């Protein structure tokens, strides 16, 4: 297995990956659902993106922008079956976002002026659980989504050999919702570890949770 280091400059994967993390990526030789995947950006392959592989080839992906919850129906290209997906109670996150924008780690009992407290919950997609963050005052403008020809707004059927990527910082992630699918050829590898974290956040070094 070949391993490539990457730095995380954006908050698109909060709280799983924070700005200032240096990660290791294990290059492929296929990603499973829920994998944190680094890939070459389709519109501009000179740029590398990191998102969660939320949709696999053949998946019917539906996103409710109000509840900010996903519905997945696998192997459907009159669908056959539905993937077990669960959501935990929404609770305050450790983070406050200011409104341009920036992220701060504020104590849950404290408040930051000109800021909004982000919400946190656990999303389970079949076998894998991870956290997502949501901005309580934000909601996607479905009209800005990438619309798949033949499909309704906010529903996508993942073509064979391609993937649907979504960030964990749900309201702060330029992902498959806006720019479409990620082709197999574009996949770089799977994120495995945090080798180093600058603000030094040595407590972050280890596995990805």
């Amino acid at each position: 297995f070949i391993y490539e280091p990457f730095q995380i400059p954006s908050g698109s994967m909060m709280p799983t990956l924070l700005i200032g993390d240096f990660i290791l990526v294990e290059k492929f030789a296929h990603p499973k659902r829920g994998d944190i995947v680094v890939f070459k950006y389709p519109e501009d392959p000179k740029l590398d993106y990191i998102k969660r592989a939320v949709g696999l080839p053949g998946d019917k992906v539906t996103y409710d922008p109000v509840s900010k919850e996903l519905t997945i129906q696998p192997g459907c290209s009159a669908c056959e079956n539905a993937l077990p997906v669960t959501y935990s109670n929404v609770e305050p996150s450790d983070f406050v976002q200011t409104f341009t924008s920036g992220f701060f780690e504020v104590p849950k009992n404290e408040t930051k002026e000109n800021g909004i407290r982000l919400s946190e919950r656990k999303e389970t997609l079949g076998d894998v659980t991870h956290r997502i963050l949501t901005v309580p005052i934000a909601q996607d403008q479905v009209g800005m989504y990438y619309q798949q020809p033949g499909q309704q707004l906010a529903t996508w059927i993942v073509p064979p050999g391609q993937y649907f990527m979504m960030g964990d910082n749900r309201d702060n992630s330029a992902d498959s919702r806006y720019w479409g699918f990620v082709p197999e050829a574009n996949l770089v590898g799977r994120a495995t570890a945090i080798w180093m974290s600058f603000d030094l956040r040595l407590s972050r070094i280890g596995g990805i949770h």
């Binding site: 280091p5 730095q7 400059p9 240096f22 740029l47 993106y49 330029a174």
Partner: peptide, 6 residues
């Protein structure tokens, strides 16, 4: 290495 990932 040390490239970025957005």
């Amino acid at each position: 290495x040390x490239g970025x990932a957005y």
